[PDB]
Coordinates of C-alpha atoms in Angstrom, one line a residue:
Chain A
X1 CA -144.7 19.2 -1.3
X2 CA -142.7 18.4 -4.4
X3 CA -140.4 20.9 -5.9
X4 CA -138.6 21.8 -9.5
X5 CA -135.6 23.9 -9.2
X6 CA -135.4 25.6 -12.4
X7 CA -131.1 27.0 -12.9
X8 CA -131.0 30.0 -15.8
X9 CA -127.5 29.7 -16.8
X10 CA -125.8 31.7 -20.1
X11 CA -123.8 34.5 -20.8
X12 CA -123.7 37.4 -19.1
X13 CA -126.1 40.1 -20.8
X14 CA -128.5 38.4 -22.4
X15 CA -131.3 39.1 -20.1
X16 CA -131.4 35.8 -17.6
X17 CA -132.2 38.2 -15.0
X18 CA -134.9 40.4 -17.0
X19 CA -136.3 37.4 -18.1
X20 CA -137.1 35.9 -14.5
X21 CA -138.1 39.8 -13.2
X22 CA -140.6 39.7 -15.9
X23 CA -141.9 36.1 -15.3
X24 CA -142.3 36.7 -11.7
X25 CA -143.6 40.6 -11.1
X26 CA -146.2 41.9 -12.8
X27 CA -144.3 45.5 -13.8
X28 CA -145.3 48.5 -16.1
X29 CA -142.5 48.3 -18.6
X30 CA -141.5 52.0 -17.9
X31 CA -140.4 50.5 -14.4
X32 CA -136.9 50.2 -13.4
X33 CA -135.8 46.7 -13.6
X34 CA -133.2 45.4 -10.7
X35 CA -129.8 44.3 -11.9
X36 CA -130.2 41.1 -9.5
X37 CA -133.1 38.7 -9.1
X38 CA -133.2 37.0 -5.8
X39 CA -134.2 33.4 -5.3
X40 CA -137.6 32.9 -5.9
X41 CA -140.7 30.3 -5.0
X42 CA -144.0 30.3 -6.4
X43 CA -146.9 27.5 -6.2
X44 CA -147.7 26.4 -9.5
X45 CA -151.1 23.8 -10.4
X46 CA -150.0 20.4 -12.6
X47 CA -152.4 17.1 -12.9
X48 CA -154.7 19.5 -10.6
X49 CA -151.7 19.3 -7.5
X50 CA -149.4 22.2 -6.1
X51 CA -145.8 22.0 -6.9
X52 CA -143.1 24.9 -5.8
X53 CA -141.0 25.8 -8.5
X54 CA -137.8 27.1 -7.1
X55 CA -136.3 29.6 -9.8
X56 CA -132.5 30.9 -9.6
X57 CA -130.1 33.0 -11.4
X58 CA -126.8 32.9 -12.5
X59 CA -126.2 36.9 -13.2
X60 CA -122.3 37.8 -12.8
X61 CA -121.0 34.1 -12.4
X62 CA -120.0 34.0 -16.8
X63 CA -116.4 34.1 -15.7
X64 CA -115.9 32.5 -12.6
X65 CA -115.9 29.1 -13.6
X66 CA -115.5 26.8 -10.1
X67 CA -118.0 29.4 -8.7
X68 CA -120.7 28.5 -11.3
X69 CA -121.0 24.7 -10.1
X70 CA -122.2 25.5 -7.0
X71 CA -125.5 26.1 -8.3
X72 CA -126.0 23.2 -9.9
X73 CA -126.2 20.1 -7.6
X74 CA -130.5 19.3 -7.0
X75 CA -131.3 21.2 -10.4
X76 CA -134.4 19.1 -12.2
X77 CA -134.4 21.6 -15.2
X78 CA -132.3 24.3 -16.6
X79 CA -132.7 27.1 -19.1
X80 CA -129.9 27.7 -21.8
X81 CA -130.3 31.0 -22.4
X82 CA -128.6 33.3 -25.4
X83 CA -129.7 36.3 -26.9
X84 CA -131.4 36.1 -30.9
X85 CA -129.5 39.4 -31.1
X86 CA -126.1 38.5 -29.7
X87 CA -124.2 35.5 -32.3
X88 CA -121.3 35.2 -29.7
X89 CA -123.8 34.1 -26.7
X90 CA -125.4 31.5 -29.4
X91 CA -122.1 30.2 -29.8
X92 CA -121.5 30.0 -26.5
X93 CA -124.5 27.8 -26.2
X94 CA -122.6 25.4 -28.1
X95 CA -118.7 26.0 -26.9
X96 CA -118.9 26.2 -23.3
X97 CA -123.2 26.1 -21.6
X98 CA -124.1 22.5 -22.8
X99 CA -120.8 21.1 -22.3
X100 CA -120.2 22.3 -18.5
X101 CA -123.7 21.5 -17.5
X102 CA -124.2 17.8 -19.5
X103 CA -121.1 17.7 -17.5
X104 CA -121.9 18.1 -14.4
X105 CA -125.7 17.1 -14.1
X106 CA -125.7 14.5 -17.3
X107 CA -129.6 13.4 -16.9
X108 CA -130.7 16.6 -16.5
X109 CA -133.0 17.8 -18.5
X110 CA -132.4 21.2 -20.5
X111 CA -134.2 23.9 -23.0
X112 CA -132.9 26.1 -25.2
X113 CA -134.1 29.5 -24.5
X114 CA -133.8 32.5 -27.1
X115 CA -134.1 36.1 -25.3
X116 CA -134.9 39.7 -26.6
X117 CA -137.1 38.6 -29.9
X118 CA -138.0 42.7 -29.5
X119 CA -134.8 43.5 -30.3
X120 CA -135.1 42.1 -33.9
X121 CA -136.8 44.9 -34.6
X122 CA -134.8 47.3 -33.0
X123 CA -132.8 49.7 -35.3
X124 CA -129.7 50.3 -33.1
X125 CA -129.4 46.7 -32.3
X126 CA -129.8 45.9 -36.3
X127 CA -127.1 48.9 -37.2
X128 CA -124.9 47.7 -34.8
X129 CA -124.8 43.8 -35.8
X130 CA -124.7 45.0 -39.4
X131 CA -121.3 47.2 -38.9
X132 CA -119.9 43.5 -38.1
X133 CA -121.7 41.4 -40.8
X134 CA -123.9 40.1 -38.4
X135 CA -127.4 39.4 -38.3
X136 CA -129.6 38.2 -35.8
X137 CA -130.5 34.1 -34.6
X138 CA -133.0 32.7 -36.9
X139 CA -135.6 30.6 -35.1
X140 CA -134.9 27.4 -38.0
X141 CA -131.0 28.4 -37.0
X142 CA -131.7 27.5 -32.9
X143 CA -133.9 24.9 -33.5
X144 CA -131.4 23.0 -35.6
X145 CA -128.9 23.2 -32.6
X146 CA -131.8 22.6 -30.2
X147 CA -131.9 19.3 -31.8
X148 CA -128.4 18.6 -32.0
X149 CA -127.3 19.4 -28.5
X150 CA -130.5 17.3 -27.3
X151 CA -132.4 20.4 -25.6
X152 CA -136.2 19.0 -25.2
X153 CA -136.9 22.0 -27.4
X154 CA -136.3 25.7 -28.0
X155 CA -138.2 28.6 -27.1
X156 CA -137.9 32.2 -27.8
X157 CA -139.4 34.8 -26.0
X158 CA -139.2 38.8 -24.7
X159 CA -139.0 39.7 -21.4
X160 CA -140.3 43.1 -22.5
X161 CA -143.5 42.9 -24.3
X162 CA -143.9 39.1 -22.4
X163 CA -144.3 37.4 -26.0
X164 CA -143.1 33.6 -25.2
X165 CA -142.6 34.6 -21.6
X166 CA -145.4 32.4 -19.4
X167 CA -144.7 29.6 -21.9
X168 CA -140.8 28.6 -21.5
X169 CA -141.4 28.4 -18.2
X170 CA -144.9 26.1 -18.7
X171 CA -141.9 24.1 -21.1
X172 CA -139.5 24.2 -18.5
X173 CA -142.1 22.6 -15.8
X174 CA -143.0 19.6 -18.2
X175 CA -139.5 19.0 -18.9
X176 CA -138.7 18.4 -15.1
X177 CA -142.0 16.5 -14.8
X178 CA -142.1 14.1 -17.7
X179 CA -142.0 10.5 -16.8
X180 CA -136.0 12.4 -9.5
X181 CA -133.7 10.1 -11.5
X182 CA -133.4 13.3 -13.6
X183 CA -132.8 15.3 -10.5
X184 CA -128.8 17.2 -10.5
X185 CA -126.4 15.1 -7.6
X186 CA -123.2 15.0 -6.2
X187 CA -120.4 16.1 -8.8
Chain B
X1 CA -133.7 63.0 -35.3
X2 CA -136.8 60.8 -35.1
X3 CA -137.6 59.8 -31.3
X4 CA -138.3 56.4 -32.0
X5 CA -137.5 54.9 -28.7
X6 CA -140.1 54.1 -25.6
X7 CA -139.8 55.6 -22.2
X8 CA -136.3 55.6 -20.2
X9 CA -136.0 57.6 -17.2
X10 CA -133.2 59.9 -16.7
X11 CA -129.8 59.1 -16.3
X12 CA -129.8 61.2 -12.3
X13 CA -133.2 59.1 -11.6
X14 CA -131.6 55.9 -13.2
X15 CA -128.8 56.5 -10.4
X16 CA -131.0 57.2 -7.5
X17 CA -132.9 53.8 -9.2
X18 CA -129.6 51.7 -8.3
X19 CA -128.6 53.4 -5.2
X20 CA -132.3 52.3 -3.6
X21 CA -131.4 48.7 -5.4
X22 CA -127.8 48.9 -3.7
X23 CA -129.7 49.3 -0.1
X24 CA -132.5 47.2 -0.7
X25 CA -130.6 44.4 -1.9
X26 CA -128.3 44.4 1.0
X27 CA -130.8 45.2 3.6
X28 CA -132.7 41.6 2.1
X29 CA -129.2 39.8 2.3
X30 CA -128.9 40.5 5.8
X31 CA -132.0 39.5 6.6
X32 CA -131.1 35.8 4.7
X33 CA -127.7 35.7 6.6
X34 CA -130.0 36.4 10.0
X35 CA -132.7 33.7 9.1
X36 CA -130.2 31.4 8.7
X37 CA -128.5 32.1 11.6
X38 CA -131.2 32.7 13.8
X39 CA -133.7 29.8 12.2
X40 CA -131.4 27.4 11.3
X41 CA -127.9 27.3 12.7
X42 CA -129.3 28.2 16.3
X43 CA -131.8 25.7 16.4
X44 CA -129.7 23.0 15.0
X45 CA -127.2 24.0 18.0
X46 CA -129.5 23.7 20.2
X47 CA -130.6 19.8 19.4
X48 CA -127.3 18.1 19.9
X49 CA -129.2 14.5 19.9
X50 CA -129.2 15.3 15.7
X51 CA -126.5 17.2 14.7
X52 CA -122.9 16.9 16.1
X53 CA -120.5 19.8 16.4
X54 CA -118.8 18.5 12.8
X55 CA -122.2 18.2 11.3
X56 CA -122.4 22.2 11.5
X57 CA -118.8 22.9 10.6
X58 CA -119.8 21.2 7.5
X59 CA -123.2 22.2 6.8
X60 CA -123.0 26.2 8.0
X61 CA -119.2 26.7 7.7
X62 CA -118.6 30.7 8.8
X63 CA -122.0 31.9 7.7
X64 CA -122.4 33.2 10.9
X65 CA -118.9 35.2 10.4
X66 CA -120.4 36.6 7.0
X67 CA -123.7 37.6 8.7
X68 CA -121.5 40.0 11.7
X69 CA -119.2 40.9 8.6
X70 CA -122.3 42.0 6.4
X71 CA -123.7 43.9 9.9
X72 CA -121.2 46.2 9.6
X73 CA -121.1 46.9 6.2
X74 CA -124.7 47.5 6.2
X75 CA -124.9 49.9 9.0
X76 CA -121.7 51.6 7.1
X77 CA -123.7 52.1 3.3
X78 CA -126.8 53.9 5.1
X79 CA -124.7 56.5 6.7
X80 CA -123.6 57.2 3.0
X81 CA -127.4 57.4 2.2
X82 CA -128.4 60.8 1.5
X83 CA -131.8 61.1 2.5
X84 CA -132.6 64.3 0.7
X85 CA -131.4 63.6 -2.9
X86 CA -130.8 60.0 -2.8
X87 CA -128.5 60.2 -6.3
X88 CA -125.7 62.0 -4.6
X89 CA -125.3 59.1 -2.1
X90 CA -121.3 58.4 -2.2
X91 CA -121.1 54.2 -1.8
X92 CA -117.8 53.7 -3.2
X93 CA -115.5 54.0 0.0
X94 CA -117.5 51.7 1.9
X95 CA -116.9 48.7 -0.6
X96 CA -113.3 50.5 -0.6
X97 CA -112.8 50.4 3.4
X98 CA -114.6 46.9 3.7
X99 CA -112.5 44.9 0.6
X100 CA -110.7 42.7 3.1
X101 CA -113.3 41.6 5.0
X102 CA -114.7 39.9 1.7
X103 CA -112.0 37.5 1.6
X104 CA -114.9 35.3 4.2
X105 CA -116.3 34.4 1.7
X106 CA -113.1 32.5 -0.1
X107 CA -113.6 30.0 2.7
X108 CA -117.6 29.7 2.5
X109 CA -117.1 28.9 -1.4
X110 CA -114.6 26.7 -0.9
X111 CA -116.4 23.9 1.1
X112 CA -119.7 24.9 0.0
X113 CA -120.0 21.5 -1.7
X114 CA -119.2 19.7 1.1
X115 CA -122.0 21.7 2.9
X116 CA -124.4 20.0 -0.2
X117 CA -123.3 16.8 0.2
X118 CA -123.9 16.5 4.0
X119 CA -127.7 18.4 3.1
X120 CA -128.6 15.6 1.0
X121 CA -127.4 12.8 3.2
X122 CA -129.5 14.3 6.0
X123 CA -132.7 14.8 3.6
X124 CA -132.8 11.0 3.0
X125 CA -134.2 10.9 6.3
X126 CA -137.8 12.0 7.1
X127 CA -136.1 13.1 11.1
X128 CA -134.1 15.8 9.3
X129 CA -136.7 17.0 6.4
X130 CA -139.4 17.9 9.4
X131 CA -137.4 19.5 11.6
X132 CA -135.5 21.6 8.3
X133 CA -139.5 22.6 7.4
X134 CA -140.2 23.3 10.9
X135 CA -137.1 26.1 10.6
X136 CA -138.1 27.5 7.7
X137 CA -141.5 27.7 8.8
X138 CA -141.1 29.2 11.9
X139 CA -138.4 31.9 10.5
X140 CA -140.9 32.6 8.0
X141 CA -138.9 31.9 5.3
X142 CA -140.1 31.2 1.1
X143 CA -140.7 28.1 0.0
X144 CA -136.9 27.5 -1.0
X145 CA -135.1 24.7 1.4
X146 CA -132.1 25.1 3.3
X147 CA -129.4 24.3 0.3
X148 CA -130.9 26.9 -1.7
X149 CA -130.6 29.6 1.3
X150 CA -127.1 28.8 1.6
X151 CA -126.0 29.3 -1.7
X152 CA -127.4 32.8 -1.1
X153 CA -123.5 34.4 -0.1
X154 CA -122.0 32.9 -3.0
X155 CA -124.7 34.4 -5.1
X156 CA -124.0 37.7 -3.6
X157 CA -120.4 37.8 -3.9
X158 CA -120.8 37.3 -7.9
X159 CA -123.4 40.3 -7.8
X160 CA -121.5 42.9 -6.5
X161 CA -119.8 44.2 -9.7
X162 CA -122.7 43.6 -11.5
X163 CA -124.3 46.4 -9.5
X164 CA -121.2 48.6 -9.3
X165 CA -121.0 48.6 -13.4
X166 CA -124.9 49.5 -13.3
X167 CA -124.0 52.4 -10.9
X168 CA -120.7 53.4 -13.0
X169 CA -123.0 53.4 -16.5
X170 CA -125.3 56.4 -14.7
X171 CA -122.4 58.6 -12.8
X172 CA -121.1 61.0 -14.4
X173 CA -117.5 61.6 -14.6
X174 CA -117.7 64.6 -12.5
X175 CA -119.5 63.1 -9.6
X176 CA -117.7 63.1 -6.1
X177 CA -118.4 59.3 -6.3
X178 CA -116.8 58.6 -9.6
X179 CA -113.6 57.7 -9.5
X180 CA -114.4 55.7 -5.6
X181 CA -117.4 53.5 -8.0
X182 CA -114.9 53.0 -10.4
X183 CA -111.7 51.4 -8.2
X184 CA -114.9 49.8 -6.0
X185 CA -115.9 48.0 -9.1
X186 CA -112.2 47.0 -9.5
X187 CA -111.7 46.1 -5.7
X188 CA -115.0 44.1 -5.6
X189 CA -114.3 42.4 -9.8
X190 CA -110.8 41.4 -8.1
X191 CA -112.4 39.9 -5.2
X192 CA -114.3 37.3 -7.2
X193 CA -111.1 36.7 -9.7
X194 CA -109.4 35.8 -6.5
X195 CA -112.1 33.3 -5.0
X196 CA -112.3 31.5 -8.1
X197 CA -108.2 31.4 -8.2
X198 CA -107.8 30.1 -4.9
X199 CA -110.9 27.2 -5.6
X200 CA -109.1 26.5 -8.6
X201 CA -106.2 26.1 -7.0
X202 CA -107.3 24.1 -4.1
X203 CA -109.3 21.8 -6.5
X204 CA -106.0 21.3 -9.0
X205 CA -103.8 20.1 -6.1
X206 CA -105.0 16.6 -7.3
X207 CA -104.0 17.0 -10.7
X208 CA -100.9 18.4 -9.7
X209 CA -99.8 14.7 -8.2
X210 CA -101.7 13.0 -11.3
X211 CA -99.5 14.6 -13.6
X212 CA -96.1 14.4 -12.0
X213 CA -96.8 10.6 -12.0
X214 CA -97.9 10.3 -15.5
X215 CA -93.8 11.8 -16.3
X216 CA -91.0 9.4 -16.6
X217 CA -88.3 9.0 -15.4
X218 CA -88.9 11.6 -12.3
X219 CA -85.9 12.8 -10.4
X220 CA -85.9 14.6 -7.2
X221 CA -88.7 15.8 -4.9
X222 CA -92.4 16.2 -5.5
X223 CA -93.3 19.3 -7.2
X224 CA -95.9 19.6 -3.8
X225 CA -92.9 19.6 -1.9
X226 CA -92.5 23.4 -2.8
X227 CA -94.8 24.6 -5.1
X228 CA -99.2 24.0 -6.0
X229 CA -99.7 26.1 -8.8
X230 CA -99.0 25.6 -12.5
X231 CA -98.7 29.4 -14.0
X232 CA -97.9 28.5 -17.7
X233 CA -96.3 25.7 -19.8
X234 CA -95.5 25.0 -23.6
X235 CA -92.8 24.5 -25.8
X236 CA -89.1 26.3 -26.2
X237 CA -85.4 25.9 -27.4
X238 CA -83.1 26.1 -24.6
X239 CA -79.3 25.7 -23.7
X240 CA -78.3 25.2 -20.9
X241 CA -74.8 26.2 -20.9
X242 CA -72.7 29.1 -23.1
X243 CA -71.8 26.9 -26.5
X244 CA -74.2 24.0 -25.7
X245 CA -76.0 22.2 -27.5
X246 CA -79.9 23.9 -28.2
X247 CA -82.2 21.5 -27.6
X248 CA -86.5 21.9 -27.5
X249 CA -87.9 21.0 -24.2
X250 CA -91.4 21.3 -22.6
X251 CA -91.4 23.6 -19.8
X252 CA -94.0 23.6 -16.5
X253 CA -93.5 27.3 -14.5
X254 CA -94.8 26.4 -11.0
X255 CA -94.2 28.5 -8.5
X256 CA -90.8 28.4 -7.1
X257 CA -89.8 26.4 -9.6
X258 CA -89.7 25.8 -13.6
X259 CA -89.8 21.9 -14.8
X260 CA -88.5 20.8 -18.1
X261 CA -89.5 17.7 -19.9
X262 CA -88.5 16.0 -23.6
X263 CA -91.5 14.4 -25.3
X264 CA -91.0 10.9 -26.3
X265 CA -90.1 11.2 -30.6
X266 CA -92.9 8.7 -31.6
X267 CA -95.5 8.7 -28.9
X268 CA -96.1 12.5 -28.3
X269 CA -98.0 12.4 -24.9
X270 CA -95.2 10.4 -22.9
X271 CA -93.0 12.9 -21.3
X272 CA -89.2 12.7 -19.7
X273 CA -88.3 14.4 -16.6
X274 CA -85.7 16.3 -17.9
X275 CA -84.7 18.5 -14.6
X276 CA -85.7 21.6 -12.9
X277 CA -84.8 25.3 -12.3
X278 CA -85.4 27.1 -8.6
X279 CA -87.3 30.0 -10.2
X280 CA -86.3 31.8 -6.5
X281 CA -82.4 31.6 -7.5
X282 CA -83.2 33.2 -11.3
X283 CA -83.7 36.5 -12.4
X284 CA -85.3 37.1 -15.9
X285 CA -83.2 39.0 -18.5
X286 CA -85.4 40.2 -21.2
X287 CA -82.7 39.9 -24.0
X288 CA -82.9 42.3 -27.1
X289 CA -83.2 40.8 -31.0
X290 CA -80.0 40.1 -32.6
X291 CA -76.8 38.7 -31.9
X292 CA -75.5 37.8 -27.9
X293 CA -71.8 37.8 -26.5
X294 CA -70.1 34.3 -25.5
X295 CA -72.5 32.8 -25.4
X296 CA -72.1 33.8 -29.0
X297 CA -74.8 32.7 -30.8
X298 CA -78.2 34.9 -32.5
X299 CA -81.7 35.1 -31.5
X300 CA -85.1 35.5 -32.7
X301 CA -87.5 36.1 -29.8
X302 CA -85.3 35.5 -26.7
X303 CA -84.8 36.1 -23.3
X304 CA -82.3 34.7 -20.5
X305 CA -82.5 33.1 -16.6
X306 CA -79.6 34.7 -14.7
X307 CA -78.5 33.0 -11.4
X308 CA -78.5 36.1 -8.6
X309 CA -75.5 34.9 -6.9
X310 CA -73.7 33.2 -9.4
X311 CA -72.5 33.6 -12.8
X312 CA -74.8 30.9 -14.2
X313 CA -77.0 31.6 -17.3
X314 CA -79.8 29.9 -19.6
X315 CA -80.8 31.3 -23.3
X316 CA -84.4 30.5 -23.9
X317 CA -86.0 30.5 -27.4
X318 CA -90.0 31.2 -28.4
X319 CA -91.2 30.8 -32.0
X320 CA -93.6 33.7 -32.4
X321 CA -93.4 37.0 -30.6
X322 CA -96.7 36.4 -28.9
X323 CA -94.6 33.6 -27.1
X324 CA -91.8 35.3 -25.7
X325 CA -94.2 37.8 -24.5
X326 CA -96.9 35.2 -22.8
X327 CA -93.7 33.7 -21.2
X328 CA -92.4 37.1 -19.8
X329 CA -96.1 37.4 -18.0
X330 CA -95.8 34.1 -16.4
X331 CA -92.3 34.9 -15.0
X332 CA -93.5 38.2 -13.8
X333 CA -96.8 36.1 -12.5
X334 CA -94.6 33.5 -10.5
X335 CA -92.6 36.5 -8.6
X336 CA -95.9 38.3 -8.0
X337 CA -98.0 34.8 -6.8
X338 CA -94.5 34.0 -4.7
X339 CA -94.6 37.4 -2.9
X340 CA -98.3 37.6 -2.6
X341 CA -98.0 33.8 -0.7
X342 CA -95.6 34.2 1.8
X343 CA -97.0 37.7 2.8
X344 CA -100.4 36.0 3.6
X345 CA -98.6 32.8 4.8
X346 CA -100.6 30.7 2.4
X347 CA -99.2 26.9 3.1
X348 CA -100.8 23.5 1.8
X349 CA -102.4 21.6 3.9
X350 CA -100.5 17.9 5.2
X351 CA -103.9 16.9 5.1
X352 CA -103.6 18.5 1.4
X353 CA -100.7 16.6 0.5
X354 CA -101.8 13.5 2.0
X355 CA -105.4 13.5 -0.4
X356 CA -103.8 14.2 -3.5
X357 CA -100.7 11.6 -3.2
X358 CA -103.4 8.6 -2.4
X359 CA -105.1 9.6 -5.3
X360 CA -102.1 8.5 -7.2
X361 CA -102.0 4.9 -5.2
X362 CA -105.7 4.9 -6.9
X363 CA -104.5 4.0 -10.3
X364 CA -101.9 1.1 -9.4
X365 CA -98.7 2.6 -7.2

């Protein structure tokens, strides 16, 4: 029975970990949210067959660099996560994410994933990128690096409210599936 | 104010929240180290017409030395738990009384890839995928194969300070467990720091060799011979001798032992062995702005390499004061890694040696 691993990689604290709580529970958002997200299989229905899409984090590995790789070998999609409200982790995309795993696992496919749309409305979060003459990720901003970096595509989403949530992952399935080839070996 | 904000629970209940997550997170761990152990590594000893003795080296390394080592520490956080106000529960000391017994898993990280390439090899062959699926199944395991479950301890030993800094953020800084959460967090932070070191050393040995054979001109033994660490290198003034001539050298700190080179004057990547210093035999004199006795010369961001025994003395020079500074670290860094090694015995492998100088033989002698 045919599988997709699926590898969330970015920096630390931007919500990789909420994001696949919130994908794979179904919580009240008043809930306390774990700080860790174990390994996770779930049966999902493509061209009317079963496929087991294996989903795994990559919380507290952002500075442990010959720790990081270990995770990647068999990987048929990944998620480059940053956060819309965090300008450093979007750079990051860029400096050190798409470089280390276009490294490792060149014919692997990849999306760029923006988290915490909610907090673009947030006031504190707004204040506080403000004091620094910041201002959060546009999505014309990502999409134009999306394109550049050769991500099949970017998506946004909030692990919160769910907005975008079911559907970076329906993107992240199609990516693996579209005409093992493209599958992470050996490195 | 305003009251703005949605629904958080309180900061006591958000403690008691990560305590529960603490327990229940390691209580699930152990249960992945025993289905391993019990589903897979005991059935795969048991069929030795499939898997030879090497075969499980490779493929389950010490996991079954990280599921007794994660026994103990499991029984050892629930007698912290206090059953009657869960919040109050005082984890710190176990991580605390435990922190050498993580240094397993510097071993499981290290050949984990190894582990993966064996995997694959096997799952090429329909034999080897059954009987895998048969394990899982009869463990009761999710839908996750056998690579995946091992890459479970490395996971875990990246997620411990992640959940010590979420227990930190809700204790306050009167709590009995404060101060034990926050040199845990340190402890268990410093753990990691040092797995990834030690990979990254183990992984640069290579490079090590590469490098000393891209140098002209080489004198003297193999910097392996003594030393498989490169601290810190870049560019200074030197001399050598009290009224010498000052020239600018690059220099390579390894421990034991500093290298100096002269970069070619047109072609600015070809380097010149230009001799060595036994970094054992030197002490570092942090020298003071100004003007120095015979040696008689004066000095913008400078220091000095006395011999202990001897008389002998080098004047080193940085440009910027960030300079002098970084280069005073990686002195104080080469004692401390030095100390640190022959305490714990840490040697490099023949085997080592003998991997990294046919590497060089790979591009032509």
């Amino acid at each position: 029975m045919q599988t997709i691993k699926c590898v969330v990689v970015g920096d630390g604290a931007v919500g990789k970990t909420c994001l696949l709580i919130s994908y794979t529970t179904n919580k009240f958002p008043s809930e306390y949210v774990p700080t860790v997200f174990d390994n996770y299989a779930v049966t999902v229905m493509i061209g009317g067959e079963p496929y087991t899409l294996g989903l795994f984090d990559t919380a507290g590995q952002e500075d442990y660099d010959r720790l990081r790789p270990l995770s990647y070998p068999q990987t048929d999609v990944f998620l480059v996560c940053f956060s819309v409200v965090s300008p450093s982790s979007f750079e990051n995309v860029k400096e050190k994410w798409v470089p280390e795993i276009t490294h490792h696992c060149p014919k692997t496919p990849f999306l760029l994933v923006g988290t915490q749309i909610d907090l673009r409305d947030d006031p504190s979060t707004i204040e506080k990128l403000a004091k620094n003459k910041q201002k959060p990720i546009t999505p014309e901003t990502a999409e134009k690096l999306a394109r550049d970096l050769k991500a099949v595509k970017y998506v946004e989403c909030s692990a919160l409210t769910q907005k975008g949530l079911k559907n970076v992952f329906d993107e992240a399935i199609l990516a693996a599936l579209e005409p093992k080839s493209r599958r992470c070996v050996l490195l | 104010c305003l009251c703005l904000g949605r629904p958080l629970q309180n900061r006591d209940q958000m403690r008691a929240n990560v305590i529960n997550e603490i327990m229940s997170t390691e209580r699930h761990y152990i249960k992945h180290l025993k289905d391993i152990c019990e589903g897979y590594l005991k059935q795969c000893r048991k069929r030795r017409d499939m898997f030879s003795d090497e075969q499980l080296k490779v493929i389950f390394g010490n996991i079954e030395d990280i599921y007794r080592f994660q026994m103990g520490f499991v029984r050892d956080l629930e007698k912290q738990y206090n059953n009657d106000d869960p919040h109050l529960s005082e984890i710190g000391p176990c991580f605390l009384e435990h922190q050498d017994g993580f240094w397993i898993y510097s071993e499981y990280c290290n050949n984990h890839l190894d582990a993966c390439m064996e995997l694959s090899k096997l799952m090429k062959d329909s034999r080897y995928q059954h009987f895998f699926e048969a394990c899982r199944l009869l463990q009761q395991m999710i839908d996750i194969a056998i690579d995946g479950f091992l890459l479970t301890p490395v996971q875990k030993i990246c997620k411990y300070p992640l959940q010590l800094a979420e227990l930190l953020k809700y204790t306050a800084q009167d709590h009995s467990d404060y101060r034990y959460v926050a040199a845990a967090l340190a402890v268990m932070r410093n753990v990691t720091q040092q797995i990834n070191e030690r990979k990254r050393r183990l992984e640069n040995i290579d490079k090590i060799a590469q490098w000393q054979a891209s140098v002209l001109d080489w004198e003297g033994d193999d910097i392996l011979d003594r030393s498989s660490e490169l601290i810190y290198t870049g560019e200074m003034a030197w001399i050598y001798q009290p009224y010498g001539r000052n020239q600018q050298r690059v220099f390579f700190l390894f421990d034991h032992q500093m290298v100096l080179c002269k970069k070619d004057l047109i072609r600015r990547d070809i380097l010149y062995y230009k001799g060595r210093i036994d970094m054992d035999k030197y002490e570092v004199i942090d020298i003071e702005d100004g003007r120095d006795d015979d040696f008689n010369v004066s000095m913008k961001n400078a220091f000095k390499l006395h011999n202990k025994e001897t008389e002998e003395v080098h004047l080193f020079f940085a440009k910027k004061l960030e300079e002098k500074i970084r280069w005073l670290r990686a002195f104080r860094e080469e004692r401390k890694m030095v100390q640190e090694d022959e305490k714990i015995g840490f040697e490099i492998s023949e085997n080592q040696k003998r991997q990294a100088a046919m590497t060089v033989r790979k591009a032509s002698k």
